[PDB]
Structure formats: structure tokens, C-alpha cells
Design a protein around this ligand. Sequence first.
Ligand SMILES: NC(=O)c1ccc[n+]([C@@H]2O[C@H](COP(=O)([O-])OP(=O)(O)OC[C@H]3O[C@@H](n4cnc5c(N)ncnc54)[C@H](OP(=O)(O)O)[C@@H]3O)[C@@H](O)[C@H]2O)c1
Ligand SMILES: NC(=O)c1ccc[n+]([C@@H]2O[C@H](COP(=O)([O-])OP(=O)(O)OC[C@H]3O[C@@H](n4cnc5c(N)ncnc54)[C@H](OP(=O)(O)O)[C@@H]3O)[C@@H](O)[C@H]2O)c1
Ligand SMILES: Nc1nc(O)c2c(n1)NC[C@@H]1CN(c3ccc(C(=O)N[C@@H](CCC(=O)O)C(=O)O)cc3)C(=O)N21
Lengths: 295, 285
Amino acid sequence: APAEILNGKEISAQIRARLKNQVTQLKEQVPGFTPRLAILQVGNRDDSNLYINVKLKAAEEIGIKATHIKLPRTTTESEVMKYITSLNEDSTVHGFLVQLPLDSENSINTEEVINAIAPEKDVDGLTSINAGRLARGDLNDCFIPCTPKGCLELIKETGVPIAGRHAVVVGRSKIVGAPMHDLLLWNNATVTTCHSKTAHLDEEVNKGDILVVATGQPEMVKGEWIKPGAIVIDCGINYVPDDKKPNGRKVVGDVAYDEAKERASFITPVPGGVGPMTVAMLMQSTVESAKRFLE
Amino acid sequence: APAEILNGKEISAQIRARLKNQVTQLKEQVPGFTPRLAILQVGNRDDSNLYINVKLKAAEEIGIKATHIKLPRTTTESEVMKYITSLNEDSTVHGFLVQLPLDSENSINTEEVINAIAPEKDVDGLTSINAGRLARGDLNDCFIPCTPKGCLELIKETGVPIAGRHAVVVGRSKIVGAPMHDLLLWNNATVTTCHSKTAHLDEEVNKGDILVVATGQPEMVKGEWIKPGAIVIDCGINYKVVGDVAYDEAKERASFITPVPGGVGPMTVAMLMQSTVESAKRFLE
Ligand SMILES: NC(=O)c1ccc[n+]([C@@H]2O[C@H](COP(=O)([O-])OP(=O)(O)OC[C@H]3O[C@@H](n4cnc5c(N)ncnc54)[C@H](OP(=O)(O)O)[C@@H]3O)[C@@H](O)[C@H]2O)c1
Ligand SMILES: NC(=O)c1ccc[n+]([C@@H]2O[C@H](COP(=O)([O-])OP(=O)(O)OC[C@H]3O[C@@H](n4cnc5c(N)ncnc54)[C@H](OP(=O)(O)O)[C@@H]3O)[C@@H](O)[C@H]2O)c1
Ligand SMILES: Nc1nc(O)c2c(n1)NC[C@@H]1CN(c3ccc(C(=O)N[C@@H](CCC(=O)O)C(=O)O)cc3)C(=O)N21
């Protein structure tokens, strides 16, 4: 009785398809309405360009107007701030994000930059105000960072109710671990947060009916740790040289998939699990923002 | 035979005396400067009146100038926002707070009222900005809620390091439970937060090397559940006054435990005073 596989690629395809239909219907229901997203970029990093293009492409297929603002490396902190303020004030923009890391020749305080974003437009959900709302249970209108948001979607796809279940979160970062706990707690699970200072991590993990791992430590969570029947969600993206792969490298998660799939009732593969969910979540946050503005 | 008692009244007394000399020292450096705290109250609850007087009493004894503004029950959210804005713009007021719960005949959104407070004067740490900072590990920048702070201070009085310990927080409210988890987590403990939807709470509590209960249910956490040798922090105030923990039973299993009263309560006022003196000093700096 091996674990059922949570196909993030197929699930995200369904999500993006449904969001397109939603967007179409909003535009027809309220003529003239244009859900708009804006991505602010500083510099010209190769990985950022790629990531940005993927986002803008998903947005245009869903029917969301995606605006890309690419500022030069020479940009100073004050200029980046002026754009953020202007984006905040632009009533045609429903949500926007600052693609990190900033690529500038000058010192720019990333945190100050990020926290200048109006909470109501913060689709990536990383501002302190937004983290604060999420952390305290304002799940009704706050923004949820794309990775933990996609993880909750996957957990819900299983059909197994979260309330009352013991969920374990390995990792406590601002991008995944922290907000992941918030989601699970406010979905009524008894959450236990683990990190690098956790003793007997194996025994801790073995208590999780729901397990979300976000450590960056390739395959550390062995299958023996997994509680029989648990829902395993692996956010890890670790590259390993493998000449048998088309591009000479394989992607492994933070969980030992092969042995963990024999224990879990549901597990996210790597690649093809949490990763493909990412862009859809941003698109979902963007539509949520647009609907709230529209109301 | 029983667990060592964490005397919040004695411990708070020491912090308050520390704060007093700090305030005296500061006035000697800048004569005429006076740290100021302001407590906004809506309504006229008897318990809230008592709690404010205690905060006012500690302030005075430390040398802090505390103002008490009591608005009638007929008050609207719009009127409350007016006072908050006044306090934000009043350069002489370093730290201020809104006593909870609000006692009004009108519907007032507590989060909107609290979030109108300038984070620099949120000595109570209830704003989303302060909550967001604590919730993410950014402790250089924020004000932590007074009760969790008092609890962390009480845990530290055991001498026992927090790192690597399995801690259990029973309750997840914005005032104590939620911020208590954050404090323990960023103090490197492995934390489990329980609430009303938690199944087998007894088995969860039994995992706690450190236990913080803030549920508001009289002696609900039984002593049998206590992990032998645990540090029990009881935030409960239930009416005789009792904690959320069955004290007599829990004291025979715990190693260190907070009595009720004279435990977490005095510490809450002491920490509020501490954040106030900090808000005053950051103003001079
Ligand atoms: N699919 C996607 O596109 C996507 C997007 C974002 C993230 N992710 C993935 O998520 C993973 C984590 O990302 P991140 O930004 O959150 O990472 P991070 O900033 O490096 O933080 C890792 C966290 O895990 C803890 N940790 C490190 N080693 C551990 C160990 N051996 N045992 C227990 N806990 C351990 C650390 O604790 P301390 O706090 O004590 O250091 C830290 O909290 C990465 O693999 C990343 O690829 C994927
Ligand atoms: N000592 C001080 O001076 C100081 C200052 C302030 C507060 N406190 C104290 O902290 C205590 C609680 O205050 P609060 O504002 O946090 O309370 P609250 O708003 O009433 O919240 C109670 C919390 O406990 C949970 N809970 C209720 N029944 C439970 C049960 N039977 N089993 C497990 N969990 C249960 C609730 O979960 P749900 O979220 O699911 O409802 C909720 O999260 C009080 O004693 C208060 O006096 C102390
Ligand atoms: N803004 C804001 N700040 C706070 O820090 C609080 C808040 N709201 N809401 C209510 C709670 C109540 N709380 C408080 C303050 C002092 C005492 C206190 O001194 N307690 C004594 C016993 C007092 C008695 O004789 O009954 C104790 O030893 O616990 C208890 C609660 C407090 O101050 N709280």
C-alpha cells in the first residue's frame, strides 16, 4: 500500500485553468475591469529574468495584465522606493512584487524596500504587516507566500481534514517554514515547529500526521522517520549530478522519497510536487487581491 | 518534594527597582525629560479598572508619567481612532496602549484600532508590524507582548537553557498564546501549540519540558499530564482565583512552577514598564 502521489503539475494546471475562467467571468460581469499585476525588477540577473518571464506568461494566459518594470543596476535605493510608492498609489495595479534578490551596484536595504509595499498589494505576502496578520489568524483577507500556499492546497487535495491532526513543520524560514506553521495552526492542526536546534528530530517527525519539510538539506528526512499513513509535503529543491538525466543533473527533495513513499498515504514527488504549484499560487493571490479591490 | 516556586512578585519587584534607577539615571542625564506612558480605555469594566490602577501604580513608583484616558461606552470606532492619532502625534507620549477588551455598545474592530497605533509607541506589541517581526524572528526591531515577555523572563529564572527543549504552549491568542510560541521558537525550543481543536491534549502536554498554559479554563490542565521535571508557566486568572493549571497536582510533578496569583501577572506589569522605559530611551537616542 504505497503512498498516493500528489501531482503538483496536474493540480496546478487545473488551478490555472480555473483562474482563467474566473478572470474571464469577472471581466464579463464587470465590463472594463482588468486584474493587474506588476513585477518590479532591479538589475538583470539571468535567473530572475527566467522566473519573471514564467510569471508574466502564466498571468497573460489567465488574462491578468502583468506589467514588468526592469530598473538598471545603477539604480539607488531611493529610486526603488519611489517606484514602490507609485505602485502603491496606482489604483490600476491590484497587486505587485519585488523580485529578489536585487541586482544593483549600490547598497539597497532589501527589508526596507519589501516593507514599503502596501499590505493590500503584497501578493508574495512577505511584508511584516502581512506576516503579522497571517501569523495571528487573519487568513480571510491576508496574502500567503506562494510556497506554503501551494503546500496547503496539496494537503487539502488529499481530502483528509486538517483539524485535530498533528502537523510537523521542519524549517522555520520567512519564505516557507514560518508561514507554513501559520496556515496549519489556523486550519486547526496541532503544530510542532522544528529547526536546526531540534534534538531527536526523527522522533519529532514521527509524530506528524501531516509533515511539511523545508530545510534545504537533501534527503535528510529518512522514510523510517515518517509516521505510517502521514501526508508528506516536500518543499526541497536540491540538485545532484546524474549523467543518466537529460541535463546531467537530478532534483531531490528534503525527504528520502523512495523509502518515505512506502510509509505515507500521500506524498509530493520531487520534481513535480510543490514546485509547479508556485506560480499558480501567485496568480491565485493576484485574483484574490483584484476581487477584494473590486468589492 | 514539590516544584520550586517561581515568585513573580519578588522577581518583578527586582526588575521594577532596576527600572526605577534607570529612569532616575536618565532624568539626571537630561533634566526635565520624563518617560511617558498613556493607557486608553473604552468603557468602565471593573477588572480593567483594577488592572490599569496596578499599571499606573508601578509606573509612578518607577518614575514614569502615566496618563489614563477613559472613554464612555457610547464611544465609536471613529472616536477611538481620534484619540489614537492624538497619542501618535503627541511627541511627549513615548509609549501608549489600548486596554482590552473594549467595552462599548457599538461594534469596534479591535485589530483596526490597535493597528492604528504607531509601532514605535506600541509598548504592548499588538500591532501587526510588531507581531510580524516576532512571528518571523526579527527581534532587534520589535516590542513583544508583555505577558509572553514575563513568561520568558520566568523561564529564564530557572537557569535552564531553552535551546533544544520541547516546549508546549496551550492556547494561541494574539495576546499570549501566539506570541509565546514565537518567543520560544526563536529562543530555539521545539514548540507545539495546542488549542481547543487539539485531540489528546494530555499527551501533548506530557511532551513539554517547558509548559505555558494560557487557556482561561480553571485548572483544566491536570498535574498528571505534566512531564516530570517540567517548567510550568501558568498565565491563567480564573474565578477564589485559580490558574489554568491544577496547581497542587502539577507542583508534585514539575520542577519549577508559577503560582496563581503572584506569578505571571506581576511580571506582565513589570515587562510593560520595561518596554515603556525602552520606548522613552529610544526616543532620546
Ligand atoms: N519549489 C520552489 O520553487 C521553492 C520556493 C521556495 C523554497 N523552496 C525550497 O524550500 C527549501 C527551504 O527554503 P528556505 O528559504 O525556507 O530555506 P532556509 O532559509 O535556508 O532555511 C532552512 C530552515 O530549515 C532549518 N534547517 C536547516 N537544516 C536543518 C536540519 N538539518 N534539521 C532540521 N531543520 C534544518 C533552518 O533552521 P535555522 O532557522 O535554525 O537556521 C531553517 O529554519 C529549499 O530546499 C528551497 O529550495 C522551494
Ligand atoms: N498574568 C497576566 O497579567 C496576563 C495578561 C494577559 C493575559 N493573561 C492571561 O492569559 C490567559 C488567557 O488569555 P487569552 O487572552 O490568551 O485567552 P482567550 O482569548 O480566551 O483564548 C483562549 C485560548 O485557549 C484555547 N482553548 C480554550 N479552551 C481550550 C481547551 N479546553 N483546551 C485547549 N485549548 C483551549 C482557545 O483556542 P481557540 O483559538 O480554538 O478558541 C484560545 O486559543 C488568561 O488567564 C489571561 O488572564 C495573563
Ligand atoms: N494593552 C494591554 N496590555 C496588557 O498587558 C493587557 C491587556 N491589554 N489586556 C488585559 C491583560 C490583563 N493584564 C494584567 C495586568 C496586571 C495583572 C496583575 O497585577 N495581576 C496580579 C493579581 C492581581 C489581583 O490581585 O487580582 C497577579 O499576581 O497576577 C493581571 C493582569 C494585562 O496587563 N493585560
